[PDB]
Alanine racemase (Mycobacterium tuberculosis), 722 residues
Amino acid sequence: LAEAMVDLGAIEHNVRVLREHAGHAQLMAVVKADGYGHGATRVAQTALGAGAAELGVATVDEALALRADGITAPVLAWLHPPGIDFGPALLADVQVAVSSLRQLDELLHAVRRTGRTATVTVKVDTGLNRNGVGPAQFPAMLTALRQAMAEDAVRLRGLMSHMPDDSINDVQAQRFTAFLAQAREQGVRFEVAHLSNSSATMARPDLTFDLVRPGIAVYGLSPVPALGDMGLVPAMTVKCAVALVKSIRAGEGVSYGHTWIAPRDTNLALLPIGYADGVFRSLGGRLEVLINGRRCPGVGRICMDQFMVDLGPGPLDVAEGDEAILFGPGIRGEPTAQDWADLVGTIHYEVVTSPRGRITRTYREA
Amino acid sequence: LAEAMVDLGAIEHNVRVLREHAGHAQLMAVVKADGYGHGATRVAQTALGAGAAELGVATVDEALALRADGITAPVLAWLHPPGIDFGPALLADVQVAVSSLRQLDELLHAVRRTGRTATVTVKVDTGLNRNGVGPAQFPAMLTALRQAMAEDAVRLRGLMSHMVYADKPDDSINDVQAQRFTAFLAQAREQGVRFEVAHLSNSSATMARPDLTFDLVRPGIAVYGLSPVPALGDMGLVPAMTVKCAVALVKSIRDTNLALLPIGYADGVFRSLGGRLEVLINGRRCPGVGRICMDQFMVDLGPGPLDVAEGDEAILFGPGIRGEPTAQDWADLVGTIHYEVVTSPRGRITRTYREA
Ligand SMILES: *Cc1c(COP(=O)(O)O)cnc(C)c1O
Ligand SMILES: *Cc1c(COP(=O)(O)O)cnc(C)c1O
């Protein structure tokens, strides 16, 4: 019907490029939100197979699904509900990042229930101000960790914070540096530090610490759009089969509300996916699809489960069953996720986490 | 962490309301797209319990899921990709709407291979200009349907078509489509063919143009309690879906406090709502601040003594009883319609049910 084809060969490519940019630092591939819509387990397997060292996700739930799928590499999780029981994480060897004193108390309580040493990371706030430990709270946090470490309740794995040439990076980096120094000055030692997302990894190599945590560039989407594709290959191609071809006459309206009235006799193609499958309704009359090497603009509203495109009045070169490409890396001239983002007024992150319903996720091996 | 809670009590209500409007017309509850994101199977069971006569879906796949879920009531599917195997539909007592001769020929091949008579409906074009047979091709279709009927390959169940407007009941195209539909009924007659039922109505036509009702109505959006003509108000319906999550964190920052809600655009929280939406927390509206992130966003609780605690419920949208925003409200802010809003929740927003 429709598919979101994920090319694990591009994933492999993207991780290799990130590894080169990260230089000496190891790579934590970020596979939260089911691999940014690309499949967390499959992308994790491929990224690890191409040399990433660790995996990063938001929730402990995300981490356990990777484990139930047989993933054995290190996994870190950093976004936790209040009151969470950290037990299952400790038992399944999931690393936990804490962003407050209460959360460390929650974690130490589970260490006591399970008898399982926690591999902890502290998430500090460097101007971000959503969550993370503040400079004011950091001394108390350090004192607790030192005591926890002394009895082997925790392993002090990491310090982390979250963000190109804007000064605001330099300051955040400095502030990050001060946290490392305070820790240093109070005799608390972390095995690694990391502050770099995809953008910082690729555009600000001077700010890379021991690890980098790229998400968006692993899927080959550009971490700084204005700069171009930065050598990455977008891994997702969303496409579907043409369900019908029909000619229509000038002056005829198409689809709900007849917001489009043909200015001339033309051929149309019905594509059988719509906004319930993740084709943003705001794309109506704005997107273009690629069919047999040609761009075809959407005409009329996007419906719940279908929309039409105009093939033009030229010699008909489309048949039922042919392939229409909605977005992809662009290599065949098809539109990109960035193109949709521009049309809709959003970011490619939201575009690749949109496909669903009848768009089936499929993979091309590397 | 978050849920899309579907009140099956509202469903039931909405369906009785629709039955009142449908009068003697039989009701086909439309449950395509997994019941408009509300859950096809559970919504179908409730609707049939509320008096719906039949179910409508877009694809045979959707119909087969209802069958696999124990539904035995009549189900009609009307959008079929090229290459579809109609065999499994026939074997599962799924009705098939065909919109071309080629589709009927495919269906007749399937009839011969399975040994099962097809219960067919013909989808005709009365104005949408999408997928329906057009008047010039209808005679050849009628002829093929008569020969098959005579030879017991098919049961001639319905004639159907779809309205160009989903929400403007008094535009004259509505009237025009209904007269085009009658003309198709005229053609059938002249070809010595009759259909058991004819249907053209969606939620809007059902509730606001009952003069245009034929034998059957096909309401979708109204079953879920969403207004088919938003300008007229809630039209006596009750939106069945409530989306909410817990406050994950409270944060002191003029001087004020923020709540972190741990769902974002990957969960279906449209990114363009950022800095525009409001949530309901302890009976007060709390405006979003900053951008919606992929898996979280912030809202302003205001300054002073806190009335809000981590773990408290935040309502993103619902019927509006408790003063929470509505799906229509999100639609107004995003520039869309509530249909797209209710098919948006996913990822960590878990669908739940309240029994009626
Ligand atoms: C989402 C996320 C990342 C990945 O960021 P990108 O911009 O996708 O590279 C890294 N670290 C944290 C804490 C994140 O939440
Ligand atoms: C979607 C659909 C409906 C439901 O329309 P509403 O506007 O939701 O009431 C009815 N009939 C067909 C053929 C449909 O595709």
User: Anything to note?
Assistant: Chain A touches chain B through 52 residues (CB under 8 Å). Chain A has two domains: 1-7+235-366, 8-218. The pocket of pyridoxal-5'-phosphate (ligand 2) is lined by residues A 304; B 30, 32, 78, 162, 166, 202-203, 218-222 (CB under 6 Å). The longest helix of chain A spans residues 167-185.
